[PDB]
Amino acid sequence: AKPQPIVAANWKCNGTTASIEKLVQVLNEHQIDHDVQCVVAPSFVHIPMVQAKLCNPKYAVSAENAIAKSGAFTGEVSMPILKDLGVSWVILGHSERRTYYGETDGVVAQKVADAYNQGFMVIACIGETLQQREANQTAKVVLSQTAAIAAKLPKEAWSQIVLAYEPVWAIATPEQAQEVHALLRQWVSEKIGNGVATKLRILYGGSVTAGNAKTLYMKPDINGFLVGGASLKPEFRDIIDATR
Amino acid sequence: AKPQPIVAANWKCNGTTASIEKLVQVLNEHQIDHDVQCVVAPSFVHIPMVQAKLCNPKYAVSAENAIAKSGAFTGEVSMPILKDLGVSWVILGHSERRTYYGETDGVVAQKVADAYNQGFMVIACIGETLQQREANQTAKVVLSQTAAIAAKLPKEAWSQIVLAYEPVWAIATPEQAQEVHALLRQWVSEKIGNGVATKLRILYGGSVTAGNAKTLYMKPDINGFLVGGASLKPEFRDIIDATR
Ligand SMILES: [As]
Ligand SMILES: [As]
């Protein structure tokens, strides 16, 4: 018994008009005959061409980041602007943004609350570094990151939340991934509620390929993927098939 | 005797599909009969619709920010991606990005060098805070910011550089603006070269409206504008006319 799986593409800061048109065509031709939420997150400037060309009924378009409000924030894209554009998914707290772009736990938690309150589906990213893993701090870190997010949310917000676990420490066996997912679900179950925990999607966001996806999705607490490199390739289709 | 003026719109983090279509239509109908480089910088997600609808022969589209390279930089837009898209202008070092998003002098200077080397026109922003102005540090600060940028550039790069002076301290009389522009030009003249200084555009990026633009452009060291709030309005056309 699992909730609806999600297979999300994080294109990060990659792509050309040519490469995106070729990829979206193949994604459009792929017949998906099971209940799965597919997500593509392009770079901001590619969002329009993706919205225009993507016809696959299982897909939604997501942003890779956002700020809460419109105004004098040169270079940033706000959640109101995204909604006007027709985008209602957003990735927040990706490890790259936590590492390079000043997104502390509190910044991430406030962004998630803002997205929730403006009616977004949120893929919120957590995960521990190699230094943190080698000091035995996996549980403390992922639970503390999740706790920061949970602190700004009412119980009913969780239908709009998806967690994505990034094993930053590896940039992992399916068993190491399962152990962290289980630990996350246990926390949500005890602290937030049993019903909320059952229904929550916890996506694996380490290295996902056509080669390992099926074995990863066999695990009871893995509800799909936040895919990096392989989501720039026709291989993404096979990763979607692996959640049958 | 002045170099070609530039009138650049910084839309910051503002706009709807509806408001942009209405604005671009009016900008498209505006007949401009003098030599001026017009620039529109939309939020990243609006770049496609602006490129698609904007027909005015005096305009180029600009990004409001960028990073140097494509790759694993979730949420950011790279200069290669912009070029593939057909964008060859970029605003860098805006005060909002210096203040809120970690852009030190060195970060800004490296971004400007990267843009130069990838063939962009760059509007590089400098300016001092109220605290800096009240401690008599206007010259030191704007010259130190310009120096950080100049340090990463060969002499021949300056044909691709435009400076924009932001009087952050006011968020200013035309005479206070002129005094800073003159001081910037003097520095470039003595340190970089007389020929480079004559030809360089120094844009005023404080509060510009249809009401004050003509008086501002009368000043000998002001070569146009980086416009904030008024560039979201039909008033922008009159600001363009003021550089006749
Ligand atoms: As189709
Ligand atoms: As036209």
TrEMBL record, chains A, B:
EC number: 5.3.1.1
GO CC annotations on file: cytosol; glycosome
Top enzyme category: isomerase
One Pfam family named in its UniProt record: TIM
InterPro entries reported for this sequence: Aldolase_TIM (IPR013785), TIM_sf (IPR035990), TrioseP_Isoase_bac/euk (IPR022896), Triosephosphate_isomerase (IPR000652), Triosephosphate_isomerase_AS (IPR020861)
Pathway, per record: Carbohydrate biosynthesis; gluconeogenesis; Carbohydrate degradation; glycolysis; D-glyceraldehyde 3-phosphate from glycerone phosphate: step 1/1
Main location (coarse class): other
Keywords tagged on the record: Gluconeogenesis, Glycolysis, Glycosome, Isomerase, Peroxisome
Alphabetical list of SUPFAM superfamilies matching this protein: Triosephosphate isomerase (TIM)
PROSITE patterns: TIM_1, TIM_2
One example GO MF annotation: triose-phosphate isomerase activity
Reactions catalysed: D-glyceraldehyde 3-phosphate = dihydroxyacetone phosphate
GO biological process, one term: glyceraldehyde-3-phosphate biosynthetic process
Subcellular location(s) of the protein: Glycosome
Assembly mode: Homodimer.
NCBIfam families cross-referenced by the UniProt entry: tim (TIGR00419)
HAMAP family listed in its UniProt record: TIM_B
Family label: Belongs to the triosephosphate isomerase family.
Protein name, per record: Triosephosphate isomerase
Species in which this protein is naturally found: Leishmania orientalis
Origin organism lineage: Eukaryota, Discoba, Euglenozoa, Kinetoplastea, Metakinetoplastina
